[PDB]
Structure formats: structure tokens, C-alpha cells
């Protein structure tokens, strides 16, 4: 409930509680990915979120 | 209600198909033949 996104200091937001069960459906349209630095570049490559 | 932890659902068939189409696009750069392995987050803040 208590979050600081965007590395914000001095302000923390409390997400108020919600009555009942929450259900939501969204589209996953894309990713944010990173490649490992360990190489062995000519061997294989691994990707992570 | 249910005593449970919050959970997120993804259909096995739909995620796989996309992965197969995506993994082929990386080989337009990383070369025709090579091994591409996927893995979860390395480490850091919870947001990451």
C-alpha cells in the first residue's frame, strides 16, 4: 500500500483499501529486457526482464 | 474470503506462441543459429 515510485523521497503514497475482490484483465503488449554482460559473446546469450 | 496470496494468470499456449515468434526476431541480429535462454530478474529494488 505504501509506495515510493520514481525514486521519490519526501513523499510516500498510501493506497487506500478496496471493498470486495478486485479482478482485472489487461493486454500484455510488450516487455522491458536486458542482456547479460558476461561474454562468451560468441557462445550464447541470455535475456532478463 | 479465500485465504490466498494475490496471483497473476497467463495462458501457457498464448505466451509460448509469442515467445517462439519473438525468439526468431532476435536472430536477425544475434545470428541465424544460437542459444537464447530466458531467466528471471537478477536483483535490485522491488520495482525492478
Amino acid at each position, epitope marked *: 500500500q505504501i509506495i515510493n515510485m520514481w525514486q521519490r523521497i519526501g513523499q510516500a503514497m498510501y493506497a487506500p483499501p478496496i471493498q470486495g*475482490v478486485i479482478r482485472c484483465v489487461s493486454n500484455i503488449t510488450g516487455l522491458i529486457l536486458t542482456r547479460d554482460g558476461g561474454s562468451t559473446n560468441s557462445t550464447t546469450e541470455t535475456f532478463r526482464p | *474470503g479465500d485465504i*490466498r496470496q494475490a496471483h497473476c494468470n497467463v495462458s501457457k499456449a498464448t505466451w509460448n506462441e509469442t515467445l517462439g515468434k519473438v525468439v526468431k526476431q532476435l536472430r536477425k541480429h544475434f545470428g541465424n543459429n544460437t542459444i537464447i535462454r530466458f531467466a528471471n530478474s537478477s536483483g535490485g529494488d522491488l520495482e525492478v
Partner: antibody
Amino acid sequence: PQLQESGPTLVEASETLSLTCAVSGDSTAACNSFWGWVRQPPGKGLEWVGSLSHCASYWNRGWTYHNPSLKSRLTLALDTPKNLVFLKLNSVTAADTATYYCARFGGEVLRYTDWPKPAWVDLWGRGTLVTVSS
Amino acid sequence: LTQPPSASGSPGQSITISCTGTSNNFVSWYQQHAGKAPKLVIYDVNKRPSGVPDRFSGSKSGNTASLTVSGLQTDDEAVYYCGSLVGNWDVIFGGGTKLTVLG
């Protein structure tokens, strides 16, 4: 907390038996217990009828439990604002003649895992005798 | 659930009635006076409800569940039924045990 049963004490065979419980001192909206019926045939043992509850989860609009044998011929209903319980039995026979009790079911109802689990009747009613004759 | 048909005892003695077929801990016992409505005397095995004397105690060993009444008295004469949750959400009752504290 008091449970008052009401309805016809004398019903003819093959007809529809209807009974209504009026709760006093508690809310049918309360998620702490289930509401249903338990019938006790004359000089015989206790038989479970069924119970339901509007307090639902994300995939349903409620929960309703029927006794496997009586399932086809019964319908369970709860009126939340009016705080009333209902029982309807279709195609009734003299074998269904019993003293019907308005029952409040306790158990793992307020905190369950997967589906809710009612196991015992904590609060009873005085009950009424319904005799089915052709 | 299988409950013994009858049970007897003198005032002050302790009676133990059994029940079998309970694989879970949801076992509960009831007391019904003849010509009256049933009243729940125990729940969740051993645990007691409000306004119920200490002398009523529930117990379950293996597949057998047991109720024990010590210090018998006139008001204890009734029919005692046991019940428990089974399967997914269904619940069943035993034949009940008739315990008499007659003269």
C-alpha cells in the same frame, strides 16, 4: 438470535412445499454463517437439506449447497434486505413429511481456503411439522 | 456416521458415546430433548459453546470421534446426534445415540 419458521403445516402429495424462516437479532448479510434448513422426519434421525450464502468470490455471485438426493426437487433462497430464508420443494411425497428446522450453519465460513466450508448448525429454530397427504 | 443406538448411566457417573466415519476434525455433537428442537452441545471436536457446562468434552482418536458426559443429571436425558463435514461441502448426521438418565 431467534429463528421463526412459517408456512403450511399440511400439504398435499406431488405439490410444492414452501417454507419461510424469519430471522431476528441478526443479519442474513453477515458473512459469519450460512443459512439453510435441516429436516427431522418423525421418530428418525437428522438429515441435512442445504444452505447458501450471497457472500461470494471473484468467479461467482454466491454459493449454494444442495443435498445430493434432494437436489432435483428443492430450491434454496435468501432475501438479504428483508432478512428472510426460503425453502421450496417440488413434487413432494408423504416420505418428505418431517419437522423442518430453520438452521444457521457455522464453520470455516468467515475465513476459508478455496470454497467455504460449513460443518455445524450453531443456531436452531423451534421448527414446524409439515405432513404430506394425498 | 455410526452412532450406538442406546446408552445409559446413573446420576454422577460418566458416559462416553462414540462416533465413527469422521476423517476430519469438523465433528460436532447435538442434544435434542424429546418434543423439542436440537441444541448444539459441542463443536470443532473438544471446544465448548456458550452456556454449556464443562462436563461436556469432545474427543477424536483415529477415525473414531467421542463425546463424554460426567456428573449425569435429569436434564441430560435426550437423543444425541453427531455430525461432520464430508467431501467438498456436504454434511451428514449419525443415527444419534439415545442417552437416558431415568430413575
